[PDB]
Amino acid sequence: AQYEDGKQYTTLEKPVAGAPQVLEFFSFFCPSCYQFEEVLHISDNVKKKLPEGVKMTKYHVNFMGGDLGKDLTQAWAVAMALGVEDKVTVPLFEGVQKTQTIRSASDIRDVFINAGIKGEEYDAAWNSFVVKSLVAQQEKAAADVQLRGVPAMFVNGKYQLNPQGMDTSNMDVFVQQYADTVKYLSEK
Amino acid sequence: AQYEDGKQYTTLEKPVAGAPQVLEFFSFFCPSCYQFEEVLHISDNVKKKLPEGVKMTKYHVNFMGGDLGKDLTQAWAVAMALGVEDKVTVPLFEGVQKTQTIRSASDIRDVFINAGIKGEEYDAAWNSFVVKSLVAQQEKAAADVQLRGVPAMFVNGKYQLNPQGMDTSNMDVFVQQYADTVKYLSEK
C-alpha cells in the first residue's frame, strides 16, 4: 500500500519476543548517529508521536571504537542507571566527534563530573553489578536482532526502519516521515 | 620538527596533476570541521606560515547531509564567486549545526541576504555558469583524490595530512605542528 515492506521498513525473518516496543541502537563514534541526535533530533520527534504508554529504549553498541567503544557502552549503562542520559548525550557526542577530547575512560568520567555527577557516585555506579547487568542487557539485545550496523531502530521486535527509502532534501520532512513510520508500525 | 611519511602525513599512490597548491575539503555538516574553523582557526594558522605565492583552496563536499549537502556545495560556490567566504562561513556552520535554522535550500539564501547580499544578486549567481562550473570543479577534485571523509587537506596534489599522527595533548602545539607540516610539504 503506502507503507511497503522493503521500502520504509523491513521485517525480521526471526522476530524477537519480549523486545522493548521501540528499540534504538547507536554509538558515539557513529557519524550518522551524531546527525540523527544532534541535528535531526530523531529520538525526540519519534517520542512526541508515539501512543500513550509505549516506552522507548536506546542502547549503545560495542562494535565501533574498539577499546573506547566498550568503555562507552559501560558509561551509557551508568547514564541509564543514574537517569542522566539527557545530561551527558550531547557532551559525549561532541567529546568524541567534535572536539575529539575523549580518548580514555578517564575522559568519559570527566564529562559526567562536569555535568554534575559526583565522582564517588560515578565510581560506585561504574563498578556496580547493576551496571554490569545493564551492559549484558545491551549486548543481549544487539545479539537478538543480529545487529551489524548503527544507527538502527526496531519496532515491537519485528520491524526495522529503513531510512534509505525517504527524501532528505528537507530535514524537517525527513524527520516527520521517519516519525510517522514508527507510529504506523507500532500500531501494526 | 621531524616529519615522516605514515606519521604526520601520507603520500598518494596516484598523484593529482593540476591540483591546487593547498587544497582543503570540508562540509557544513561536519562537526570537527566546525571546530577546526571557529575554535582552532586551522586555516588561518596555515596561511600565516605559507611561503610567498602560495594560495589556499577550500572546497565543500556532497557526501554529508543527504540532498541538502548538494545545495550547500552550490551555496559555497556562490560564496566563492561573490568573494564573501569570510562573511558567510561561520553563519552557515551555526545555521546547520548550532541554531539549526537551515533545514532546506531556502534557508541558505536568507543567510546571504542577512550578510548584505541582494536577493536578486544571489539568485542570479546561483544560476550562473561560473557557479555551475565551480560546483563541477569541487566534485571532480574530491573524485580525483578519492576522498573518503572530511576534514581533509592535500598538498601539491601529492601529500595528505594525517592529524592522527600529530601531537594532540596540547592544542596550541597541535595547531602549529599542523601548520608546519603544511609548510614543510609545500617545499617539496
All cell numbers assigned to B177: 605542528
Contact: A98, B32; criterion CB under 8 Å = yes
* Number of neighbours of residue A11 by Cβ within 10 angstroms: 11
DSSP three-state, residue A106: helix
Q: How far is CA B37 from CA A70, A140, B31, B140, in A?
A: 31, 41, 10, 24
Q: Which residue of B has its CA nearest to A98?
A: B32
CA dist B19 and B73 (Å) reads 19
* Number of neighbours of residue B26 by Cβ within 10 angstroms: 24
B104 contacts in A (CB within 8 Å)? 169-172
B112 contacts: CB under 8 Å, gap ≥ 6: B75, B78, B79, B84, B88, B122
Helix A129-144 to helix A119-127 angle (10° resolution) is 60
By residue count, chain B amounts to 188
Quick one: which of A151, A141, A105 has its CA closest to A126?
A105
CA dist B158 and B25 (Å) reads 15
Q: How many independent structural domains does chain A possess? A: 1
CA dist A120 and A126 (Å) reads 10
Contact B10, A77 (CB under 8 A): no
Q: Which structural domain, as residue segments, surrounds residue B71?
A: 1-188
By residue count, chain A amounts to 188
B29 contacts in A (CB within 8 Å)? 35, 39
Element (H, E) at A57: strand A56-60
* Number of neighbours of residue B135 by Cβ within 10 angstroms: 20
B165 contacts in A (CB within 8 Å)? none
B96 contacts in A (CB within 8 Å)? 39
CA dist A138 and A132 (Å) reads 10
Quick one: which of A137, A187, A182 has its CA closest to A160?
A182
- Quick check: A98 contacting B, CB < 8 Å? yes
Q: Which residue of B has its CA nearest to A93?
A: B31
Angstroms from B27 CA to nearest CA on chain A: 13
Strands A152-155 and A159-161: antiparallel
Amino acid at A19: A
Q: Which domain CATH number covers A110?
A: 3.40.30.10
Grid cell 519485528 — which residue? Answer: A158
Touching B: A residues 18-77, CB under 8 Å: 34-35, 38-39
DSSP letter for B163, please.
G
Contact: B68, A98; criterion CB under 8 Å = no
Contact: A98, B168; criterion CB under 8 Å = no
Contact: A169, B29; criterion CB under 8 Å = no
DSSP letter for A118, please.
-
Contact: B104, A168; criterion CB under 8 Å = no
Q: How far is CA B17 from CA B52, B89, B145, in A?
A: 21, 28, 11
What residues pair up with B153 in beta bridges, in sequence order? B24
